[PDB]
Ligand SMILES: NC(=O)c1ccc[n+]([C@@H]2O[C@H](COP(=O)([O-])OP(=O)(O)OC[C@H]3O[C@@H](n4cnc5c(N)ncnc54)[C@H](O)[C@@H]3O)[C@@H](O)[C@H]2O)c1
């Protein structure tokens with residue numbers, strides 16, 4: 022968040038747009054990244070393990086999992102070394118053609134909650150002080166999720 | 179001189195929120211003051227709206243797994259109120275509001291009645307369907323005698339209709355004491371009620387009076403019926419629903435919505451205030467004072483505060499928008515008390531301490547969804563898993579509730595049984611009273627007066643302070659609240 | 661005058677990063693504003709570079725388990 | 740068929756069991772809990788909490804004056 026805000030603030034002085042690259046896990050992360058000044062949001066793992074993603078699904082513990090690894094992992098440098106990445110597995114998400122519209126609708130509903138009819142208007146509100154923010158202690162984030170239940174199922178789309 | 183000297187220890191509510199951290203209920207404590215009274219003198223009288231006033235700051239949330247006729251009735255009996263959900267056809271909700279408005283404290287609601295042009299098998303069907311087998315039959319529907327269980331237990335065929343010997347009835351309408359007397363003096367089970375025309379208007383079943391307790395905290399309107407609320411949306415279809423709901427005599431309308439500061443909510447507020455100037459409208463949800471200002475100008479009578487804090491909510495990790503609930507409650511209540519509007523701390527309540535903190539930060543009423551769900555008055559039927567009785571509890575923005583492009587802002591889950599409202603809400607009331615006594619406030623109005631004047635002091639809690647503030651250092655333990 | 665009055669609630673993005681904590685996405689929220697339109701009027705048009713312009717702010721990362729011809733095609737189809 | 744009462748009990752216990760069988764009478768009651776007018780309204784509450792029924796055919800000492808049943812006590816809070 023800090024990186025995105027600071028680099029976007031410096032780069033908007035020169036009309037350069039930046040790309041919030043990494044750490045995206047929900048649609049809310051996308052809305053926050055776009056609100057802090059990122060013009061585009063690059064997603065690696067939110068898109069991996071879909072039908073359009075390279076590699077073939079495998080199986081483990083009865084869930085369809087593709088492979089997801091970092092370009093700085095060891096298993097990817099093999100194509101003294103210091104791995105700056107990790108190789109792992111992501112459960113199937115479906116297809117891009119049914120997932121990316123979910124993100125688009127989520128981004129739109131978030132931007133409507135905010136009160137911004139456009140992403141350019143969203144960033145205009147952010148830079149002019151009209152868009153307000155709010156920190157969250159760790160308790161506020163625990164409360165901001167799902168709590169107080171015995172068990173539950175979360176369906177996004 | 180005058181007033182005295184107390185040392186300054188702790189933060190005021192203004193200093194507590196000056197650091198602009200996202201404080202929530204678990205993040206702070208209230209420092210104790212001076213006890214000069216007992217816990218039972220605490221006056222929990224709360225302002226639900228500008229003109230409505232309850233005797234218990236509890237509300238049940240308009241969710242389809244929380245509030246229907248049963249819980250609304252229970253809550254209004256215990257001193258609070260309920261808000262019937264609108265995840266149903268408008269006539270369903272209006273019928274629920276009516277069912278509440280005609281509860282009448284010991285009589286029967288919607289009594290299954292039959293007619294002489296029936297068989298002796300219809301009463302067997304009623305037994306297998308509803309549960310009772312004593313029916314006050316009469317001409318067509320809703321006075322000839324009653325057919326009860328002790329009239330059919332020696333038959334094996336479906337064609338008993340007790341004659342007019344039951345001179346044990348009430349003339350027009352009697353108190354519960356008169357009914358107690360007539361039952362003691364008449365020794366039978368059904369006590370039908372008649373009028374000058376001598377038609378079935380009401381009926382009393384003996385099992386009711388055998389366990390009819392008292393409810394001193396009334397929550398009743400002028401005509402002495404229970405209060406009831408109703409969630410209506412803000413689309414075009416909801417004006418018809420609002421018509422049906424005011425025809426049933428609903429006392430208060432909450433504009434059910436995630437983000438209540440829209441042109442739609444303001445339009446609907448204006449429509450309601452222009453059409454039924456007697457209706458008390460509650461707008462929400464709002465977490466900032468700008469939203470509160472828009473809605474208070476529009477003319478709401480109360481505000482409903484909370485966005486993302488609910489137990490089944492995922493709005494914040496989906497829409498990225500919300501506020502920590504302690505901060506939201508404090509800020510919106512501080513802005514709304516400038517206009518005499520009372521707010522409703524809506525969401526995130528999990529203990530009695532959360533209720534005391536919400537009321538201390540300025541909330542006049544505290545709305546509870548999951549703290550009340552999975553009780554006996556809550557809609558839906560218990561199921562089983564891992565040997566614990568669990569009802570269903572879901573969010574009105576979940577997928578399983580929109581199914582009655584799509585983005586779920588809620589989650590469906592299960593809550594273990596809590597018991598009944600009539601034994602749980604008194605636990606909360608006693609807890610609120612003992613908390614308010616620890617604080618040193620003899621009423622909720624005095625509590626908020628202490629908070630706004632700097633007399634009530636607060637205290638933050640690092641995460642370590644919250645770990646320590648719970649149960650720790652034990653091998654294993656059992657926590658019984660009540 | 662001629663701009664209205666809204667109460668000040670919450671931090672601006674400048675004040676949010678003035679404390680110099682290491683804030684990330686999970687550390688803050690956006691406070692809501694005024695809805696005067698529907699969710700489907702939101703124009704997600706984004707500037708990828710100085711001259712390129714997409715209609716959806718999403719990109720797939722250049723990683724060997726994410727983007728090849730198939731996902732690139734799909735992503736460009738979705739905007 | 741038939742049963743055979745065990746004798747892992749005192750002889751009087753087993754004889755009482757044999758008697759209880761020999762006087763079953765098909766629809767009547769065996770060992771009816773009966774009270775006497777020189778009792779309180781609390782003895783019937785004790786009978787309810789002990790056996791389960793609350794309808795007792797009271798009479799002079801044991802085993803005829805009328806019966807006291809459940810629908811005669813459900814509006815009282817004192818033991819006379
Ligand atoms: N934190 C919260 O309080 C919270 C959060 C999410 C969901 N919910 C519950 O979810 C329920 C419904 O889900 P929701 O979040 O989408 O609320 P909602 O009923 O307001 O959803 C309606 C959607 O269409 C728009 N809308 C409302 N009225 C409209 C009108 N006349 N014309 C055009 N558009 C209109 C709104 O922007 C909204 O996106 C609500 O009853 C609410 O109780 C509550």
Ligand SMILES: Nc1ncnc2c1ncn2[C@@H]1O[C@H](COP(=O)(O)OP(=O)(O)OP(=O)(O)O)[C@@H](O)[C@H]1O
Pocket residue numbers: 286287288289290291309310311312313314326327367383384385386
């Ligand atoms: N016609 C009726 N209509 C609606 N509710 C009734 C009716 N009769 C009894 N009840 C309600 O349902 C409950 C059951 O009544 P109750 O069991 O005491 O008498 P009953 O009808 O004779 O049943 P049973 O023969 O099993 O004893 C009552 O508490 C009362 O609230």
Ligand SMILES: Nc1ncnc2c1ncn2[C@@H]1O[C@H](COP(=O)(O)OP(=O)(O)OP(=O)(O)O)[C@@H](O)[C@H]1O
Pocket residue numbers: 312324325326327328329340343344345346365366367368369370
């Ligand atoms: N107000 C009443 N007046 C006169 N008779 C009544 C009245 N209520 C019920 N009865 C009659 O008294 C008899 C007994 O009915 P009652 O309601 O007292 O018990 P029940 O629920 O029918 O059966 P049980 O005694 O096993 O619970 C019935 O024949 C019934 O017709």
Ligand SMILES: Nc1ncnc2c1ncn2[C@@H]1O[C@H](COP(=O)(O)OP(=O)(O)OP(=O)(O)O)[C@@H](O)[C@H]1O
Pocket residue numbers: 768769770771772773787791792793794795796808809810
């Ligand atoms: N004095 C009694 N002594 C022994 N057994 C009795 C007695 N009264 C009832 N019972 C027996 O115990 C059972 C109790 O059923 P019953 O309906 O007759 O109780 P009751 O008189 O209606 O009191 P309650 O209202 O508590 O049910 C009967 O099946 C019967 O076999």
Ligand SMILES: Nc1ncnc2c1ncn2[C@@H]1O[C@H](COP(=O)(O)OP(=O)(O)OP(=O)(O)O)[C@@H](O)[C@H]1O
Pocket residue numbers: 365793794806807808809810811
């Ligand atoms: N043979 C009987 N003759 C006259 N009165 C009786 C007789 N048996 C019971 N009663 C009386 O009639 C009334 C009805 O009581 P009854 O035995 O029918 O049911 P109960 O067990 O008392 O209550 P419930 O209906 O819940 O079972 C009682 O006041 C009782 O004193």
Ligand SMILES: O=c1[nH]cnc2c1ncn2[C@@H]1O[C@H](COP(=O)(O)O)[C@@H](O)[C@H]1O
Pocket residue numbers: 042043044045063064065066067090091092093094105106107721722723
């Ligand atoms: O091997 C790696 N080590 C560390 N970071 C990587 C590596 N490969 C890719 N990345 C970055 O991680 C991002 C993945 O996004 P995310 O996993 O969805 O958070 C990519 O867009 C790259 O910027």
Ligand SMILES: O=c1[nH]cnc2c1ncn2[C@@H]1O[C@H](COP(=O)(O)O)[C@@H](O)[C@H]1O
Pocket residue numbers: 239240241484486487488489490491492493524525526527545546547548549572573574575576587588589
């Ligand atoms: O579907 C939903 N998604 C997010 N929040 C909801 C939803 N339905 C109800 N709520 C809110 O969550 C509250 C539930 O309170 P709680 O679960 O006891 O914290 C309700 O009073 C509503 O304000």
